[PDB]
């Protein structure tokens, strides 16, 4: 019984990790605290100017942060309760067995 979260903003990811792990801890017991998986960075290097000024670029990255959380003893008073949560917009959740 597992959940993994994804986001471009770690402040939203790290927050909704705790408010998830806690809610299962509410109707617990056993939850495996949020693990930070390594972040996957997609970089973009761009010529700074619109014309011909090759030796001047500017950088850009895209961080997809990764959190995994495990709930051990289901207790269907969270397999019910979790469905009603408050997850901000910059976050995607995959749930697993």
């Amino acid at each position: 019984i597992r959940i993994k979260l994804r986001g471009f903003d770690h402040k939203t990811l790290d927050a909704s990790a705790q408010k998830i792990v806690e809610a299962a801890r509410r109707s617990g017991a056993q939850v495996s605290g949020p693990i930070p998986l390594p972040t996957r960075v997609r970089r973009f290097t761009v010529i700074r100017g619109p014309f011909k000024h090759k030796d001047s670029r500017e950088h850009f990255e895209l961080r997809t942060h990764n959190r995994l959380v495990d709930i051990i003893n289901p207790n269907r008073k969270t397999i019910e309760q979790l469905m009603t949560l408050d997850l901000p917009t910059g976050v995607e959740i995959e749930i697993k067995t």
Binding site: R6, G7, F8, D9, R42, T64, P88, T89, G90, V91, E92
Partner: protein
């Protein structure tokens, strides 16, 4: 030409994106297109209301556009009946349930995008370009702003020899990240060509 865009410089520190969503490599772009397409509609239609910031929020097949308009009465219409005509016309290209909030503007003379648009308007309306700069920067400071700067470029007065005119009050620490600097741009079309209007408001540090 040297200076960095002060908002792209503060993303993550003082400034939040105009789009909040994760999406994967396989369909990020397609969301970006709608995003750009959406704003086009609303800057095209809600310019008259004094548009300032289109925040676009996404969860899954339901999108949450949020307009920041100076006079929201020009948006809602006959009691939700203009908002409706576009709360619908948005889904006409959205395809998703396009939930559309309108948010008040705290003080328009503290929204750099607006100051720009208004100076741009005045120079599109044949006023004295030097005057409009010194006036806008005055109005902003009266509004408790801790510093404000405005910049015009192009053929001021239709003068053949293009020029750059600016004026600044208070203080504008562009090299400081903890400085909250609302920066907006407006573009001024005239019979003689185009002029660029840049407005910097120091809202204060954090």
């Amino acid at each position: 030409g040297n200076k960095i865009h002060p908002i792209g410089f503060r993303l993550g520190i003082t400034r939040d994106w105009e789009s909040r969503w994760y999406a994967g490599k396989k369909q990020y772009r397609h969301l970006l297109l709608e995003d750009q397409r959406i704003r086009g509609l609303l800057e095209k239609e809600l310019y008259s209301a004094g548009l300032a910031r289109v925040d676009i929020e996404r969860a899954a097949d339901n999108v949450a556009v949020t307009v920041h308009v100076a006079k929201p009465g020009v948006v809602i219409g006959r009691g939700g009946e203009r908002i409706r005509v576009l709360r619908e016309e948005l889904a006409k290209l959205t395809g998703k349930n396009v939930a559309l909030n309108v948010q008040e503007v705290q003080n328009p003379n503290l929204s750099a995008p607006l100051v720009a648009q208004r100076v741009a308007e005045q120079i599109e309306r044949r006023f004295a370009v030097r005057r409009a700069i010194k006036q806008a920067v005055q109005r902003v400071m009266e509004s408790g702003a801790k510093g404000a700067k405005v910049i015009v470029s192009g053929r001021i007065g239709g003068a053949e020899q293009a020029r750059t005119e600016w004026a600044a009050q208070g203080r504008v620490p562009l090299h400081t990240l903890r400085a909250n600097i609302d920066y907006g741009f407006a573009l001024a079309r005239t019979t003689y060509g185009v002029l660029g209007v840049k407005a910097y408001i120091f809202l204060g540090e954090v």
